[PDB]
C-alpha cells in the first residue's frame, strides 16, 4: 500500500528557569521508530522499533547531532516569536513542527510537507508545490520573505523528494516483517440493555494496523447516523489500534442493523450482525 515517514517536534518554553522542554518523535506510517526527549538522561536520539536498531553508530551520532540542532532552532524561534507578537517574557509558549513524505504503492514520491505552528495555530507551511510558502499572518509574512531570500524551500524540496523517500524505502525493507504486515481488525459485536425496551449494539474493531479504518452502521441496508456514537481511533499500547461504533435500537429489532468495517487488511469489507443467542 501507500506509506509515509513523518517527524514531529514540540518545544515548550519555561520562562521561570532554563531551556524549553523539547520532544521529537519519528514515525514510519503509524509506527513510532525514534524519539528524543530533552528531559531524558541519554541526550541521544533513541530507537523505538527493532528494525531501526540495525543502524550503525554513525547513524545514531548523526541523528543525535541533527535532533539537538532542531531543539536549538526551536529555542531561537521561541525568542523570535515572542518579539514578533510583543509578548511578555513571563509566559510559556509552544512551537510545533512536522515534516515528511508520502509514497504510493510503488514506493515513489507522492507528496511532501513541512509545517510550523506557534501556540497551537498555523504559522508558516510549505505549499504542496514545495516551492512556495503559506504565511498565516503578518509575523509569518516576515518569515516568508526571509526564507524566500535564503533558498529554504529548495533545500526542503530536495530532502522531501530525495533523502526522505530514500530512507523511507530503506526502513520499509529493513522493517518488512512488521511495517509491510497489515493487521486486519479483529471484530465482534456486544449488546448492552439500556432499558427494558431498548439496547445498545456496539461494533468493535481491535488490534488493527494501520490506524486508518471506517466503521458504519446500516439499518435495513441504508446508512444510519441517528442514535449512533463513534469513538476516536485509539492506541492499544502494543502498536495496534482500536475503535468502536454503537447504535441504540428497539429491543427485538437487532437483526435490521449491520456494522460495516473497511480496512487495508481486509480484501472485502466485513459485515457484522448481532447473533440473538449470544
Amino acid at each position: 500500500g501507500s506509506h509515509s515517514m513523518r517527524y514531529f517536534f514540540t518545544s515548550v518554553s519555561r520562562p521561570g528557569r532554563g531551556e524549553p522542554r523539547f520532544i521529537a518523535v519519528g514515525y514510519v506510517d503509524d509506527t513510532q521508530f525514534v524519539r528524543f526527549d530533552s528531559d531524558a538522561a541519554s541526550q541521544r536520539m533513541e530507537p523505538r522499533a527493532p528494525w531501526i536498531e540495525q543502524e550503525g553508530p554513525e547513524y545514531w551520532d548523526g541523528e543525535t547531532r541533527k535532533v539537538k540542532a532542531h531543539s536549538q532552532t526551536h529555542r531561537v524561534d521561541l525568542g523570535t516569536l515572542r518579539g514578533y507578537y510583543n509578548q511578555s517574557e513571563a509566559g510559556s509558549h509552544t512551537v510545533q513542527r512536522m515534516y515528511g513524505c508520502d509514497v504510493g504503492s510503488d514506493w515513489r514520491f507522492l507528496r511532501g510537507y513541512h509545517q510550523y505552528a506557534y501556540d497551537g495555530k498555523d504559522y508558516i507551511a510549505l505549499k504542496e508545490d514545495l516551492r512556495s510558502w503559506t504565511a498565516a499572518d503578518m509575523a509569518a509574512q516576515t518569515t516568508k520573505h526571509k526564507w524566500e531570500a535564503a533558498h529554504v524551500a529548495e533545500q526542503l524540496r530536495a530532502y522531501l523528494e530525495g533523502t526522505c523517500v530514500e530512507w523511507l524505502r530503506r526502513y520499509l525493507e529493513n522493517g518488512k516483517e512488521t511495517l509491510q504486515r497489515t493487521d486486519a481488525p479483529k471484530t465482534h459485536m456486544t449488546h448492552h440493555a439500556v432499558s427494558d425496551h431498548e439496547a445498545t449494539l456496539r461494533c468493535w474493531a481491535l488490534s488493527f494496523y494501520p490506524a486508518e479504518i471506517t466503521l458504519t452502521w446500516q439499518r435495513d441496508g441504508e446508512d444510519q447516523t441517528q442514535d449512533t456514537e463513534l469513538v476516536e481511533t485509539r492506541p492499544a499500547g502494543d502498536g495496534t489500534f482500536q475503535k468502536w461504533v454503537a447504535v441504540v435500537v428497539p429491543s427485538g429489532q437487532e437483526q435490521r442493523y449491520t456494522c460495516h468495517v473497511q480496512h487495508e487488511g481486509l480484501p472485502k469489507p466485513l459485515t457484522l450482525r448481532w447473533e440473538p443467542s449470544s
Binding site: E63, L81, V152, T163
Partner: peptide
C-alpha cells in the same frame, strides 16, 4: 533520517 533544515523563523 532527519533533515538539516535552515528554517530559522
Amino acid at each position: 533520517a532527519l533533515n538539516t533544515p535552515k528554517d530559522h523563523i
